[PDB]
Amino acid sequence: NNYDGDTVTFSPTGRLFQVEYALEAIKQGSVTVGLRSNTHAVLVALKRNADELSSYQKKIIKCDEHMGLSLAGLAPDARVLSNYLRQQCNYSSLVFNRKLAVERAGHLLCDKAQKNTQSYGGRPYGVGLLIIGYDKSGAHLLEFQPSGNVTELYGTAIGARSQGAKTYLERTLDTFIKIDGNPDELIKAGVEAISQSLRDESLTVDNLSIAIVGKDTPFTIYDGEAVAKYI
């Protein structure tokens, strides 16, 4: 109200309204699902078009051979944060000959987002990220909020109507976690999860974006006729 003019101001109840408004930009964003087994981690994203002449806005960004994320909210903010992850993944490889742990990637994103919430002049990031990766401790899924809060999960969803996909995954938890050494079945579970967040529109060939990373699978994005198999 009087306390939402900048990110440096607490409200009388100890809330940061600029951060809460940034969090709102994510809810307006198109739905994206993350889920993993013990062998593979999968991103599924519903891409959003401007109109019938326009392309569908790309949602999934590759960060390294073993790590990448899906975005919901301000796409340029995802580009800045994903670029930062690309550099941190790259620094780890060049200096230490070491693939960056997904958990440490989460800690780095948290700390970068935090600095924008405690300084004058800046603004919070207006995007939410689902980071998947396969490192030395197996498959990982992270959820990033521009508050700085990063959370390790078996599955989740962010964006408009994400609650439908999240409830489904909460039911299926015991089933999809056990889908080991079967990439196609894990993606099916992700496509079935994101389907709980659709209204009026359905998954078409230029609508659906899928990414997968796993034990002997580099981070690869599937778009166009490569996802027709799953429609």
Binding site: K62, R86, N90, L94
Partner: protein, 222 residues
Amino acid sequence: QFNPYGDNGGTILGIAGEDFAVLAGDTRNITDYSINSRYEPKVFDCGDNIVMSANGFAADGDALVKRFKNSVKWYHFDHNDKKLSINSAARNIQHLLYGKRFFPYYVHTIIAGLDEDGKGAVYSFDPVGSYEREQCRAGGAAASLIMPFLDNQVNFKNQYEPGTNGKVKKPLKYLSVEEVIKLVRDSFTSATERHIQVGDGLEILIVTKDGVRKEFYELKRD
């Protein structure tokens, strides 16, 4: 005073065929009169069907190759996974090298691959990023021993048609990968005999439309 440069010896050879390219190097690493390693690889697969060697000061060579490999990774990120053509790689490596024009990478760089018409390509660089597309280039210690031989046995220089008394040059024939590898092996065998820094092993990376494959041959260990 402190000298930031050294000589790790070694010799490299790039030959461009009609529809293939080979980049070969000895696997010996030396300082002065000592052998550091008999097998320290010098020729690297950088991705996008490009093989690279930066011969001379091994530290500068490792640094340049590392930076170029990283350049390929970021080219993919920045340009929607577009394949880096050998000519674009060559121009990129010039900028990497010329960036240190006043404190150079003390290396002779050769890259091999296929051009955009699928024909064999070799690019040769000086330490400060001067570069040329070539069919044949030896670099390193035994370069002066190898290049005259290649001039004669690849380009058929100073060879004429018998009975023409030098009026008809010996006609240039397209060399197969098998004949080029014979010339590479004989080049290094000869260099190993006459150059004290050359020996131990020969690693050849062959580039075709099918990708990069690796052949290794032992050299004399004296």
